[PDB]
Amino acid sequence: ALGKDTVAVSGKWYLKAMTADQEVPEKPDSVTPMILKAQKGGNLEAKITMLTNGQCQNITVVLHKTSEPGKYTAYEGQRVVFIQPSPVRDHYILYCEGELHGRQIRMAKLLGRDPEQSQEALEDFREFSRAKGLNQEILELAQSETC
Amino acid sequence: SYELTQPPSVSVSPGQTANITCSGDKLGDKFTSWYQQRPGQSPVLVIYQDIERPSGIPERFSGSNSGNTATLTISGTQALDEADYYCQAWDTSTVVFGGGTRLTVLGQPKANPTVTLFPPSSEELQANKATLVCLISDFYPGAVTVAWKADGSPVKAGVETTKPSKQSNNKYAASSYLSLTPEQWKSHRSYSCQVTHEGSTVEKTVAPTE
Amino acid sequence: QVQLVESGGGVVQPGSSLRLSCAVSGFTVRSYGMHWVRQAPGKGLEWVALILFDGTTKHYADSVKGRFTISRDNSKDTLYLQMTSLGAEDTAMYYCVRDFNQFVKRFVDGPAFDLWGQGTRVTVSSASTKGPSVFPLAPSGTAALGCLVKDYFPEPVTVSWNSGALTSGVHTFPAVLQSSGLYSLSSVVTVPSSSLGTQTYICNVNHKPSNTKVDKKVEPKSC
Ligand SMILES: *[C@@H]1O[C@H](CO)[C@@H](O)[C@H](O)[C@H]1NC(C)=O
Ligand SMILES: *[C@@H]1O[C@H](CO)[C@@H](O)[C@H](O)[C@H]1NC(C)=O
């Protein structure tokens, strides 16, 4: 059977906020809405475009399921991705522990169904990020739609 | 490309459970969906995501997708369920539909086709055309296959066949037309129409000669 | 308040470019992957094309790929199917459907068509309203006397026998289209061989769409 929670996180998301515990060298100019496709076998496929230096990176990432609901793995187990819903509606928080580009990085991402920034959602996102120990800047990102 | 496969036809009695099956590689690694197309109506989703049933659909309907085959199961089968069921699944950036399964809730004694072959009309011949006419009638259940033979060799072109249609007797009836040149007609020894219904075959043949 | 309703249906010629359109209510078309599904007369279902909620993501069957286009106007809340370079194969009842597992708040990799239109029929043939060519089917202790109505482009058609003198033994068959793109139909009366000796038999065909009415005396055609 497929996870009701896994289906609940499927579809179009706007990537809004983005805390960290380390500086991220590459930053996209703007990002395309994120799409989460629930697959048979509990795995989530995830696509986003990052417009950066005036060019479109077309990301595709598969979050492999685990024994713990909420915990997904990617990049051949190199990155963990916890997925939790916000108390604010139409908003989720990703929390990516792991390492990428040969560098250990802890990020948090604020997902929203609607592009309209919610100051209540951002507040809660900060509070959480700080509690987890992500105490850097909070990039609210530019939401473009196409290249 | 990728192809789903279902029995062309299935028959059950009232009450008896019905088992329509869908077959293809990598099924059970794929999500399947089932549609009911009652006689003369639009399709209706009966089962999605292998086992999941939409609202309104009765509990009698159930799904399964074990291994390389997927099954639609209908308990308490009754007249209302008589329809053409199709399975569907996604592959190669395409949606694949099966060929469907006419399900007949047997409510009438089985009936054997009477078949009637007609040759090209002298008038038609003179018109610089020719048409052979196969007329199947009084058969139940309502499925039939039609095969044309040119001197025992199969004919696969210029053939047109109708879906069976119900009649006043509550039985079905259908027709098949074979088009050919006047030359094709007189340059073969005989032409024959074979009609298979519930295992048995009725064949009828004619000749260019009177 | 039916949620999906197709339009653009009718008749066309091989060298045509008919555009179908599906008018949506109850939801926005920017929100769902929306598919077109054809069904040929007598045949089963055949998926034609889909357009994702992305609106940039579009896939078509290879059969139609290159010839067809899918598109939508979120403002008009209408989905379109631009059919071009029309073939005789394309002739079908075209349905627009909504993939309910391709929604902005539910994307499951398992297409499921909850909402089905009522469809719209398309007929492809380079022929104007034509009338029937009606050839007899002669008998050879009862007999089967028939009539073959052939090549009548306007779908509707009728048949009678002895101007209503014959009531029993008479059965008419559904028509069938052809590669020519012209319909063809038949009808027969089961008859006593004694009656075939004397009683005369004429079939009275009527094809109002062409404004024609043909009668044909069926007889042994002995030689
Ligand atoms: C990038 O993503 C867009 C969005 O779907 C897609 O159309 C395009 O083919 C992708 N390729 C490029 C240009 O990187
Ligand atoms: C139909 O197939 C399923 C497959 O598991 C089986 O459980 C069921 O008993 C079958 N019933 C009939 C009528 O064959």
Task: Say if residue C25 is exposed, middle or buried (CB neighbours under 10 Å; 0-12, 13-18, 19+).
Answer: exposed
Quote the CATH superfamily of domain A4-132.
Calycin beta-barrel core domain (2.40.128.20)
Question: Going by DSSP bridges, is the β-strand pair A11-20/A34-38 parallel, antiparallel, or unpaired?
Answer: antiparallel
Q: Do C14 and C74 fall within a single domain?
A: yes
Q: Are C210 and C129 in contact (CB under 8 A)?
A: yes
Report CB contact under 8 Å: C53, A12.
yes
Task: Give C148's contacts (C-beta < 8 A, 6+ positions apart).
Answer: B118, B121, B124, B131, B133, C134, C135, C136, C137, C184, C185, C186
Q: Is there a domain that residue C197 lies in?
A: yes
Way the structure was solved:
X-ray
Q: Which chain C residue lies closest to A37 (C-alpha atoms)? A: C107
Q: Which chains touch B (3 or more CB pairs under 8 A)?
A: A, C
Quote the ligand 2 centre to B73 CA distance (angstroms).
7
Domain range for C33: 4-124
CATH of the structural domain B114-206, one choice from 2.60.40.10, 2.60.120.10, 1.10.10.10, 3.50.50.60: 2.60.40.10
C143 and C119 within one domain: no
Distance from the Cα of B43 to chain A's closest Cα (Å) equals: 25
In chain C, DSSP assigns E strands to 4-7, 10-12, 19-24, 32-39, 45-51, 58-60, 68-73, 78-83, 92-103, 106-107, 113-116, 120-124, 133-137, 142-152, 158-161, 170-172, 183-192, 202-207, 212-217
Chain B interface mutation, best of C70, C113, C182, C185, highest count of B Cβ atoms under 10 Å: C113
Place of tokens 């994702």: C52
Tell me the C-alpha distance between C90 and C75, whole Å.
29
Q: Provide the residue type at C121 as one letter.
A: R
Q: Are C207 and C184 in contact (CB under 8 A)?
A: no
CA B19 to ligand 2 center in whole angstroms: 6
Resolution for the entry shown, Å? 3.1
Residue where a domain terminates, one of C124, C151, C174: C124
- Are residue C109 and residue C148 in the same domain, yes or no? no
How many helices, marked H, and strands, marked E, lie in chain A?
2, 9
Give the separation between CA B52 and CA A4, rounded to whole angstroms. Answer: 12
Residue B81 CA to ligand 2 center (angstroms) comes to 17
**B-chain residues within 8 Å CB-CB of A2?**
49
**Eight-state DSSP code of residue A75:** T
φ, ψ of residue B178 in degrees (nearest 5) = -110, 120
Residue nearest to atom 3 of ligand 1 (CA): A58
Number of alpha carbons in the 13 Å side-chain half-sphere of residue B112: 5
What is the CATH number that goes with domain B9-105? 2.60.40.10
User: What burial class does residue B178 get, using C-beta atoms within 10 Å of its C-beta: 0-12 exposed, 13-18 middle, 19+ buried?
Assistant: buried
Cα-based angle A85, A86, A89 (whole degrees, multiple of 5): 100
In this structure, which residue's CA is closest to atom 7 in ligand 1?
A: C56
Long-range contacts at A102-107 (CB < 8 A, ≥ 24 apart): A103/A22, A104/A22, A105/A20, A105/A21, A105/A22, A105/A24, A106/A20, A106/A21, A106/A22, A106/A132, A106/A133, A106/A134, A107/A18, A107/A19, A107/A20, A107/A24, A107/A134
**Which bin fits C55, alpha (ψ -120 to 50), beta or left (φ > 0)?**
left
Tokens of C33: 């992957």
Q: How many Cα neighbours within 13 Å face the side chain of C54?
A: 18
d(CA B115, CA B132): 13
Chains with at least 3 CB pairs less than 8 angstroms from chain A: B, C
Indicate left, alpha or beta for A101 from its phi (over 0: left) and psi (-120 to 50: alpha): left
Measured CA to CA, the distance from residue A79 to residue C104 in angstroms comes to 26
CATH number at residue C22: 2.60.40.10
Concatenated DSSP letters of C23-52: EE-SS-TTSEEEEEEEE-TTS-EEEEEEE-
> Using CA atoms, how far apart are residues C55 and C34, in angstroms rounded to an integer?
10
Q: Which of the residues B49, B53, B66 would you substitute to probe the A interface, choosing the one with the greatest number of A C-beta atoms within 10 Å?
A: B49
B19 CA: nearest ligand 2 atom: 1
Stretch(es) of chain B classified as CATH 2.60.40.10? 9-105, 114-206
Residue B202's identity, in one-letter code, is V
3 state DSSP class of B185: helix
- C222 inside domain: no
Q: How many CA atoms lie within 13 A of B48 on its CB side?
A: 17
Question: Do residues C149 and C87 both lie within one domain?
Answer: no
- Select from C92, C124, C156 the last residue of a domain: C124
Phi, psi of B79 (to 5 degrees): -45, -40
3 state SS for C54-81:
CCCCEEECCCCECCEEEEEECCCCEEEE
- Paired tokens of B66: 């074990």
In whole angstroms, give the CA distance from residue B205 to residue B186: 14
Q: How many CB pairs under 8 A join B and C?
A: 134
Q: Which two tokens stand for residue A133?
A: 């120990």
Residues C100, C157 share a domain: no
Give the total number of structural domains in chain C. 2
Asked if C56's CB is within 8 angstroms of A10's CB, the reply is no
Same domain for C45 and C155?
Answer: no
Instruction: For chain B, state the CA radius of gyration.
Output: 21
Q: Is C109 part of the contact surface with chain A (CB cutoff 8 Å)?
A: yes
Same domain, C93 and C138: no
Q: Do B30 and A40 make contact, defined as CB atoms within 8 angstroms?
A: yes
Q: Answer whether B61's CB lies under 8 Å from B53's CB.
A: yes
Identity at C132, one-letter amino acid code: P
Other CB atoms closer than 10 Å to residue A69's CB: what's the count?
13
Residue-range domain boundaries for chain A: 4-132
Contact yes or no for B135 and C186 at CB 8 A: yes
The whole-angstrom separation of Cα C101 and Cα C99 is 5
Q: How many CA atoms lie within 13 A of B134 on its CB side?
A: 30
Q: Which of C104, C124, C144 is the last residue of a domain?
A: C124
Residue B37 C-beta-side C-alpha neighbours within 13 Å = 21
* C-alpha span between A57 and B84 (Å, rounded): 46
Verify that C156 and C71 share a domain, yes or no: no
Chain C residues with CB under 8 Å of B131 CB are: 135, 148, 150, 184
